[PDB]
Single-chain antibody
Framework: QVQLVQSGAEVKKPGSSVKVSCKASGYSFTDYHIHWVRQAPGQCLEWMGVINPMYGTTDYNQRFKGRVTITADESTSTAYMELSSLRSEDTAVYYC????????????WGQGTLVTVSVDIVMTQTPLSLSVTPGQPASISCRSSRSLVHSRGNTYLHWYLQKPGQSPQLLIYKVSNRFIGVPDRFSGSGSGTDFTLKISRVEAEDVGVYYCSQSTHLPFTFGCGTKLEIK
């Protein structure tokens, strides 16, 4: 089974450096890109960078240029993210995620590493939170600053659910494709810049934060999330 296991939580002073590990197993390590995404306390998801472990080639989010270094060790099947000159604004849960070109997005995520410091497409999610009567439907909207159409038949707009205390899990990829084991009560629609995730009947297991994500253009970007509650 594909697994990403990250190093433990870190408490750091401002100005220090942190290096987070991401140990991969269950697939050929060099055949997939490893991306790093952080979740700051305002719960928006911020893409930091990527490593192609076959060649050691990287790409970083400009906001972090000269501060982040992503490395990969093929002999240990481990990817690393080093963040230097830590500010209190860097307090966040750092995640590694394995990207593939069938979904076009991060499918397998590490459990996350809490680090406590003691040209972007804008993704707008609506509503900020909602509560639903058990068994009732729910609808979450995502609007992008520019078209997410990548090429003929390909729009890289995805929906994740982050259950409480868990990592984001992929529900829908490429607007309406349902990921493995995702029940048919989750359905995605839309085109260009306007998208919707519909839940036909909300179950107790559906509680959490839903995110839209685009991987049509670098830097990959996410919506700031929709908290769903049952009430």
């Amino acid at each position: 089974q594909v697994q990403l296991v990250q190093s433990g939580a870190e408490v750091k002073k401002p100005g220090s450096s942190v290096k987070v590990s991401c140990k991969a197993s269950g697939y050929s390590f060099t055949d997939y890109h490893i991306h790093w995404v952080r979740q700051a306390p305002g719960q928006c998801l911020e893409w930091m960078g990527v490593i192609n472990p076959m060649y050691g080639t990287t790409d970083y989010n400009q906001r972090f240029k000269g501060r982040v270094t992503i490395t990969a060790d093929e002999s240990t099947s481990t990817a690393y993210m080093e963040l230097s000159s830590l500010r209190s604004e860097d307090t966040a849960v750092y995640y590694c995620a394995r990207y593939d070109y069938f979904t076009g997005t991060g499918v397998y995520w590490g459990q996350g590493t809490l680090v406590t410091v003691s040209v972007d497409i804008v993704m707008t999610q609506t509503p900020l939170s909602l509560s639903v009567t058990p068994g009732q439907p729910a609808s979450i909207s995502c609007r992008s600053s520019r078209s997410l159409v990548h090429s003929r038949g390909n729009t890289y707009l995805h929906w994740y659910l982050q259950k409480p205390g868990q990592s984001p899990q992929l529900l829908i990829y490429k607007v309406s494709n349902r990921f493995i084991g995702v029940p048919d009560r989750f359905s995605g629609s839309g085109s260009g810049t306007d998208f919707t995730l519909k839940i036909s009947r909300v179950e107790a297991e559906d509680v959490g934060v839903y995110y839209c994500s685009q991987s049509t253009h670098l830097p990959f970007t996410f919506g700031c999330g929709t908290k769903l509650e049952i009430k």
